[PDB]
Amino acid sequence: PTINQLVRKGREKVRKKSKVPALKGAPFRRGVCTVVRTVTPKKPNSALRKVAKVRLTSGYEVTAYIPGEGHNLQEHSVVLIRGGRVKDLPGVRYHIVRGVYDAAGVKDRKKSRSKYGTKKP
Amino acid sequence: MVKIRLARFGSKHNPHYRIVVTDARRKRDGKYIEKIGYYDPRKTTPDWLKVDVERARYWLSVGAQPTDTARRLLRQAGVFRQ
Amino acid sequence: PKKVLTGVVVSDKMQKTVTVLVERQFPHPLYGKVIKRSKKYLAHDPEEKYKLGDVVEIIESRPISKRKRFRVLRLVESGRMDLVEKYLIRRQNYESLSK
Amino acid sequence: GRYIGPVCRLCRREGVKLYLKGERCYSPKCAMERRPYPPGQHGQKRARRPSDYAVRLREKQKLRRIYGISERQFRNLFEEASKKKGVTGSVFLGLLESRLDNVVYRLGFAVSRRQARQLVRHGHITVNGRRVDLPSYRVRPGDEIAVAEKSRNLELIRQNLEAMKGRKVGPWLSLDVEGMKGKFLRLPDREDLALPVNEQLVIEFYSR
Amino acid sequence: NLSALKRHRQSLKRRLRNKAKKSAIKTLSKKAIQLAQEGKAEEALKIMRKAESLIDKAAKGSTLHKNAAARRKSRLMRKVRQLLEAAGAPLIGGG
RNA sequence: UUGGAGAGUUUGAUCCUGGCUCAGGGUGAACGCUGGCGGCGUGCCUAAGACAUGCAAGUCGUGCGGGCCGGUCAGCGGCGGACGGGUGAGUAACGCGUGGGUGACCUACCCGGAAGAGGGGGACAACCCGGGGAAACUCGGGCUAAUCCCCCAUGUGGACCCGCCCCUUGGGGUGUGUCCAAAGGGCGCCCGCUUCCGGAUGGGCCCGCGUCCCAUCAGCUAGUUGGUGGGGUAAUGGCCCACCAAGGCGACGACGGGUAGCCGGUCUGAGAGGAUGGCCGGCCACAGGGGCACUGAGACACGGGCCCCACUCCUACGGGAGGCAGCAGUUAGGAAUCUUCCGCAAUGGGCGCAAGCCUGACGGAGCGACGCCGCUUGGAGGAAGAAGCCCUUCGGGGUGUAAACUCCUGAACCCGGGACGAAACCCCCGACGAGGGGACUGACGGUACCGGGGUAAUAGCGCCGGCCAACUCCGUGCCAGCAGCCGCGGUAAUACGGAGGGCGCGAGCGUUACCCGGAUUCACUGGGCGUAAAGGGCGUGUAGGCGGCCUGGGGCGUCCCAUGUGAAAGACCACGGCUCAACCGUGGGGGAGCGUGGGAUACGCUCAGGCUAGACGG
Ligand code: SF4
Ligand SMILES: [Mg+2]
Ligand SMILES: [Mg+2]
Ligand SMILES: [Mg+2]
Ligand SMILES: [Mg+2]
Ligand SMILES: [Mg+2]
Ligand SMILES: [Mg+2]
Ligand SMILES: [Mg+2]
Ligand SMILES: [Mg+2]
Ligand SMILES: [Mg+2]
Ligand SMILES: [Mg+2]
Ligand SMILES: [Mg+2]
Ligand SMILES: [Mg+2]
Ligand SMILES: [Mg+2]
Ligand SMILES: [Mg+2]
Ligand SMILES: [Mg+2]
Ligand SMILES: [Mg+2]
Ligand SMILES: [Mg+2]
Ligand SMILES: [Mg+2]
Ligand SMILES: [Mg+2]
Ligand SMILES: [Mg+2]
Ligand SMILES: [Mg+2]
Ligand SMILES: [Mg+2]
Ligand SMILES: [Mg+2]
Ligand SMILES: [Mg+2]
Ligand SMILES: [Mg+2]
Ligand SMILES: [Mg+2]
Ligand SMILES: [Mg+2]
Ligand SMILES: [Mg+2]
Ligand SMILES: [Mg+2]
Ligand SMILES: [Mg+2]
Ligand SMILES: [Mg+2]
Ligand SMILES: [Mg+2]
Ligand SMILES: [Mg+2]
Ligand SMILES: [Mg+2]
Ligand SMILES: [Mg+2]
Ligand SMILES: [Mg+2]
Ligand SMILES: [Mg+2]
Ligand SMILES: [Mg+2]
Ligand SMILES: [Mg+2]
Ligand SMILES: [Mg+2]
Ligand SMILES: [Mg+2]
Ligand SMILES: [Mg+2]
Ligand SMILES: [Mg+2]
Ligand SMILES: [Mg+2]
Ligand SMILES: [Mg+2]
Ligand SMILES: [Mg+2]
Ligand SMILES: [Mg+2]
Ligand SMILES: [Mg+2]
Ligand SMILES: [Mg+2]
Ligand SMILES: [Mg+2]
Ligand SMILES: [Mg+2]
Ligand SMILES: [Mg+2]
Ligand SMILES: [Mg+2]
Ligand SMILES: [Mg+2]
Ligand SMILES: [Mg+2]
Ligand SMILES: [Mg+2]
Ligand SMILES: [Mg+2]
Ligand SMILES: [Mg+2]
Ligand SMILES: [Mg+2]
Ligand SMILES: [Mg+2]
Ligand SMILES: [Mg+2]
Ligand SMILES: [Mg+2]
Ligand SMILES: [Mg+2]
Ligand SMILES: [Mg+2]
Ligand SMILES: [Mg+2]
Ligand SMILES: [Mg+2]
Ligand SMILES: [Mg+2]
Ligand SMILES: [Mg+2]
Ligand SMILES: [Mg+2]
Ligand SMILES: [Mg+2]
Ligand SMILES: [Mg+2]
Ligand SMILES: [Mg+2]
Ligand SMILES: [Mg+2]
Ligand SMILES: [Mg+2]
Ligand SMILES: [Mg+2]
Ligand SMILES: [Mg+2]
Ligand SMILES: [Mg+2]
Ligand SMILES: [Mg+2]
Ligand SMILES: [Mg+2]
Ligand SMILES: [Mg+2]
Ligand SMILES: [Mg+2]
Ligand SMILES: [Mg+2]
Ligand SMILES: [Mg+2]
Ligand SMILES: [Mg+2]
Ligand SMILES: [Mg+2]
Ligand SMILES: [Mg+2]
Ligand SMILES: [Mg+2]
Ligand SMILES: [Mg+2]
Ligand SMILES: [Mg+2]
Ligand SMILES: [Mg+2]
Ligand SMILES: [Mg+2]
Ligand SMILES: [Mg+2]
Ligand SMILES: [Mg+2]
Ligand SMILES: [Mg+2]
Ligand SMILES: [Mg+2]
Ligand SMILES: [Mg+2]
Ligand SMILES: [Mg+2]
Ligand SMILES: [Mg+2]
Ligand SMILES: [Mg+2]
């Protein structure tokens, strides 16, 4: 565009979109589990991925992934959720934090224990 | 009224005062009208006390009231000397 | 010092008051090109000497009323109906901008 | 605080001798004279081509491990050197060489930089009379480094100064073995340091 | 529980005094203006003198500011002179 | 000239276009695993939700009369309580920033100068008696002091009307008339009092320029816009009222909706720019939600008053009390944010002649790796190289000088000493002046630090397919699981889990959220539109943007010089104090913009006079 056109109209800035709107600007959110189940991933992966339906303190109700091998979550469990989507699961945008509230740490975990919330043996 | 007093600067257990002219209602570490001297009570330096004598004389002439410590420091620097 | 502006009388429908159109130029802060802007001032004209088309100087003054904080200082030139015509045509064009 | 583990593995990884032990480094049993390959299970397998990032990282790690300084302090010193006027590589080398522990290692009061750190920390070294117990203290030209008057009759210090009566310190330093005292004359030159380091690689590493 | 109670008591007393003085000033000014409107010039200036004296005090205190007292006097004198000019001959005082 | 790195992923392969993702830095952070010491900073970002308990503003007997036993209590009378402290709700605004104006204004206490301080009169509290009331409190009768109130006099002076002069918005002189002052106290001074002028400080009001998003918000406005007269104010003004005219604003974005305290600065960035405004300094707004005024130099007043509403508490049901966004602390909400600490010793503030009193300001201590900085968990020697563990081509290889082992030093601990920060006010002399002499005063704190003894004394976290540094074995078999992108895993997985080994950091290491960078991917610096996304279906034309050759004037843009401003802190440079560093002190330099004075005229603009190469006509 010409200089006069830039003076008349300018350049439009770029507005970013939040990928974790249910967090409402917080790093983490507490919630209560309503449904715990397994879901199947999209092509090409094949598995039974453990997820929870979580009703949060911020008013939203979302789906969160449960990482690690084995878990103790069930209906009415209190959990903490953090950002981060699971690529191969449709509509899953959040991760349950292991080792907080009613979500126990991963048993017999020996590597990368700060994730999965396992104490030093 | 306008006063000549000491504003605290420096850090914890390390006080360094500025001899400043300011309105009495201002908080002690707030904005002042002008700055005329400085003081180091611990005397860690060869020159731990400086006073602008002519400016202090001017401000005294127009009704500024010094504080006890400020008056003592001005007397040490020789403002009231005749 | 009191600010003095120069402009052209574009309205004299009020008593003892003239509308003065003042123009200023400035470079664009980011794009650098010199651009023109205009602003209208209501100015006190107690003797009603100045009429449409007059180019006059006004000076910042004690408030004469709301919206009236300038006084006509002196006349600069007369017979400038073309500037008034530009302003009136620009104002008239707004009627076709509605929806 | 600092690295307190095995130290010859650092030389074997860097592929060169970093004189981090003292007497054993000049002995035939130096680990770089017996097993000059990197430690671990795969140290004797053919090396792959190192990437640019690998080359610059290894050069920087070699320079850092020579002086036994943490990465935070190393980077702060580098940024400070980059701020100063003067060729940043030479200024950085001079700033590294002005540390008190390195200065008393070069003066000969210790046989290793680790031993020099323990000497400075434990209150055995005085700068211009007053005692200094901080390895990171930066020596300015003209400062006098010496052993504490009550520490002169120490066996380790006695042996160290005995073994240095023949050795001659660098041009940027002066030593009095009888007087048991040193003197820091000027900032060391880049040519005066026999460092197996290309400092341009370190600068380029920190430009990333 | 404080000395604010004393301040409130004293403020009420001062409010009574200020209200009394201002009421007297207003009444006298209105009376003088009406008498001048009659014209009736002899008594109008006497009442105007009383009003002026009651304006200058208690401008000596916190009842009236000096500028407010001056403005009061100026407006009163101007109105009186205008009304008497609309009427006939003058009288003593206030000129 | 101090300053600029890219990579992975569309194909059988290639070049381009283009999105997505990553490597860096930062935070008032939070979560996980781990956790030794100190210094300096810093800590409700959410419910401007509600608050138990203690403290956060008093002081003067050298203003005055009293009750009670030199004090104490309350009262009358001064001054302070409008500062200091907290918060960010509201506000898109002359609120803020920057530069100015006020012939349209105020200013207690402080300083300088001039003049004065005469006489007379009186009331209300306290107090002594009766009542009313559950209480909170309240009424009646009588007495009384003052620096309490009133009157007269005096007029250095000043205020008002009307003239006159100069000046020019209501500035300064001058003349008749009118009006206005005052208070004492202490031992000849001191502290006080009244009128005016001036200074200094602190403010009110006004103006130019700057100040976010949506045009799928396009028209808005009736005290509205102006005038006349008046009311009100310290003062201008539709600020308010009565009357007269019909104006005012808007595509240069009015009006409407959404969002938001603003700045010095901070983070990021090669710069330009982008984001942001926690702490610290400045300004504004607010004090349970609304409205209002009184007193006062100053408030429409956080710990003053009145009314309405919601809420909490007392209860004899008539009535009454209250407002932590002060310091701590509780409770609720939340991912999340501390002690119901010590002291007025320092600095500052109010009162007082002074002594002194008050001060949750402030100076300090405590808690939290929340951040930055410094330090320790040891140093030297020590096997062609133990045991364990892992791999093996079964010969061996690795962990590894690592360990063990010997020698050395001596964080923690112990004993003794011991701070700086504090010399003033005060008293003596001198003259309560200048100038000399002497004394008191430490929360931090028996702390920092110093000297002498003294033990070998915490290590963890992430990662190892490519980006990207660091590889093997076993287990599993599209399962379990990993994942930032590309992608791994379906019986021989460097990509899942464990183990051995390795790499990077290290009292930390990772993760989530958000901002800048990389992104020249909104391109001013610095991009494009034949076929990749992108030329309007075509004319005519309004506003606007841009414009040929020559001469002179102006000097608006533009440039230069001087000067004022651009606070402090922060950023930079130098020096210096804490044993270094963080941190701090001193000095110097910069710095966009804006006001003022001066200069230049090539270019742009503008005025005037010409020319014909553009354009139009014959
Ligand atoms: S002995 Fe050799 S390998 Fe070992 S630390 Fe000394 S120089 Fe390095
Ligand atoms: Mg073009
Ligand atoms: Mg697959
Ligand atoms: Mg790990
Ligand atoms: Mg304009
Ligand atoms: Mg303008
Ligand atoms: Mg008018
Ligand atoms: Mg419509
Ligand atoms: Mg009182
Ligand atoms: Mg009446
Ligand atoms: Mg008043
Ligand atoms: Mg008044
Ligand atoms: Mg692909
Ligand atoms: Mg690409
Ligand atoms: Mg294709
Ligand atoms: Mg492909
Ligand atoms: Mg933590
Ligand atoms: Mg502990
Ligand atoms: Mg601390
Ligand atoms: Mg808050
Ligand atoms: Mg207290
Ligand atoms: Mg305040
Ligand atoms: Mg706010
Ligand atoms: Mg808000
Ligand atoms: Mg708002
Ligand atoms: Mg708005
Ligand atoms: Mg302004
Ligand atoms: Mg300004
Ligand atoms: Mg009597
Ligand atoms: Mg009775
Ligand atoms: Mg009574
Ligand atoms: Mg009575
Ligand atoms: Mg009196
Ligand atoms: Mg009199
Ligand atoms: Mg902003
Ligand atoms: Mg009206
Ligand atoms: Mg109005
Ligand atoms: Mg109006
Ligand atoms: Mg700035
Ligand atoms: Mg920079
Ligand atoms: Mg910059
Ligand atoms: Mg703010
Ligand atoms: Mg505000
Ligand atoms: Mg409010
Ligand atoms: Mg509240
Ligand atoms: Mg007052
Ligand atoms: Mg008043
Ligand atoms: Mg207010
Ligand atoms: Mg109030
Ligand atoms: Mg108050
Ligand atoms: Mg309160
Ligand atoms: Mg009221
Ligand atoms: Mg109510
Ligand atoms: Mg009853
Ligand atoms: Mg509180
Ligand atoms: Mg608040
Ligand atoms: Mg709360
Ligand atoms: Mg919570
Ligand atoms: Mg809770
Ligand atoms: Mg927090
Ligand atoms: Mg004090
Ligand atoms: Mg004091
Ligand atoms: Mg108290
Ligand atoms: Mg503390
Ligand atoms: Mg550290
Ligand atoms: Mg060893
Ligand atoms: Mg002391
Ligand atoms: Mg001791
Ligand atoms: Mg010792
Ligand atoms: Mg590699
Ligand atoms: Mg995988
Ligand atoms: Mg993993
Ligand atoms: Mg396998
Ligand atoms: Mg991996
Ligand atoms: Mg594995
Ligand atoms: Mg960068
Ligand atoms: Mg890129
Ligand atoms: Mg960009
Ligand atoms: Mg780029
Ligand atoms: Mg461009
Ligand atoms: Mg392009
Ligand atoms: Mg094309
Ligand atoms: Mg093309
Ligand atoms: Mg096509
Ligand atoms: Mg495109
Ligand atoms: Mg196309
Ligand atoms: Mg076309
Ligand atoms: Mg088309
Ligand atoms: Mg067509
Ligand atoms: Mg057209
Ligand atoms: Mg056309
Ligand atoms: Mg058209
Ligand atoms: Mg045109
Ligand atoms: Mg010019
Ligand atoms: Mg500055
Ligand atoms: Mg130093
Ligand atoms: Mg400075
Ligand atoms: Mg100028
Ligand atoms: Mg031209
Ligand atoms: Mg021409």
Coordinates of all heavy atoms in Angstrom, one line a residue, chain F residues 133-134 316-318, ligand 54:
Chain F
rG133 P -39.0 7.8 83.6 OP1 -40.3 7.1 83.3 OP2 -38.5 7.8 85.0 O5' -37.9 7.2 82.7 C5' -38.1 7.1 81.3 C4' -36.8 6.8 80.6 O4' -35.8 7.9 80.7 C3' -36.0 5.6 81.0 O3' -36.6 4.3 80.6 C2' -34.7 5.8 80.4 O2' -34.7 5.6 79.0 C1' -34.5 7.3 80.6 N9 -33.8 7.5 81.9 C8 -34.3 7.8 83.2 N7 -33.4 7.8 84.1 C5 -32.3 7.5 83.4 C6 -30.9 7.3 83.9 O6 -30.5 7.4 85.1 N1 -30.0 7.0 82.9 C2 -30.4 6.8 81.6 N2 -29.4 6.5 80.8 N3 -31.6 6.9 81.1 C4 -32.5 7.3 82.1
rA134 P -36.8 3.1 81.6 OP1 -37.6 2.1 81.0 OP2 -37.3 3.7 82.9 O5' -35.3 2.6 81.8 C5' -35.0 1.7 82.9 C4' -33.8 0.8 82.5 O4' -34.2 0.0 81.3 C3' -32.6 1.5 82.0 O3' -31.7 1.8 83.1 C2' -31.9 0.5 81.1 O2' -31.2 -0.5 81.8 C1' -33.2 -0.2 80.4 N9 -33.6 0.4 79.1 C8 -34.6 1.3 78.9 N7 -34.8 1.6 77.6 C5 -33.8 0.8 77.0 C6 -33.5 0.6 75.6 N6 -34.1 1.2 74.6 N1 -32.5 -0.2 75.3 C2 -31.9 -0.9 76.3 N3 -32.1 -0.8 77.6 C4 -33.1 0.0 77.9
rA316 P -35.1 -7.0 77.9 OP1 -34.3 -7.7 78.9 OP2 -35.7 -7.7 76.8 O5' -36.2 -6.2 78.6 C5' -37.6 -6.1 78.1 C4' -38.3 -5.0 78.7 O4' -37.8 -4.7 80.0 C3' -38.2 -3.7 77.9 O3' -39.3 -2.9 78.1 C2' -37.0 -3.0 78.5 O2' -36.9 -1.6 78.4 C1' -37.1 -3.4 80.0 N9 -35.9 -3.5 80.7 C8 -34.7 -4.1 80.3 N7 -33.7 -4.1 81.1 C5 -34.3 -3.5 82.2 C6 -33.8 -3.2 83.5 N6 -32.5 -3.5 83.9 N1 -34.6 -2.6 84.4 C2 -35.8 -2.3 84.0 N3 -36.5 -2.5 82.9 C4 -35.6 -3.1 82.0
rC317 P -40.7 -3.1 77.2 OP1 -41.7 -2.1 77.6 OP2 -41.1 -4.5 77.3 O5' -40.2 -2.8 75.7 C5' -40.5 -1.5 75.2 C4' -40.5 -1.6 73.6 O4' -39.2 -2.2 73.2 C3' -41.6 -2.4 73.0 O3' -41.9 -1.8 71.7 C2' -40.9 -3.7 72.8 O2' -41.5 -4.5 71.8 C1' -39.5 -3.3 72.4 N1 -38.5 -4.3 72.6 C2 -37.9 -4.9 71.5 O2 -38.3 -4.5 70.4 N3 -36.9 -5.8 71.6 C4 -36.6 -6.2 72.8 N4 -35.6 -7.1 72.9 C5 -37.2 -5.6 74.0 C6 -38.1 -4.7 73.9
rG318 P -43.3 -0.9 71.5 OP1 -44.2 -1.2 72.7 OP2 -43.7 -1.1 70.1 O5' -42.8 0.6 71.7 C5' -41.7 1.1 70.9 C4' -41.2 2.4 71.5 O4' -41.0 2.2 73.0 C3' -39.8 2.8 71.1 O3' -39.7 3.3 69.7 C2' -39.3 3.7 72.2 O2' -39.9 5.0 72.2 C1' -39.9 3.0 73.4 N9 -39.0 2.0 74.1 C8 -38.8 2.0 75.5 N7 -38.0 1.2 75.9 C5 -37.6 0.5 74.8 C6 -36.6 -0.5 74.6 O6 -36.0 -1.1 75.5 N1 -36.5 -0.9 73.3 C2 -37.1 -0.3 72.2 N2 -36.8 -0.8 71.0 N3 -38.0 0.7 72.4 C4 -38.2 1.1 73.6
Ligands
MG54 MG -39.6 1.2 79.5

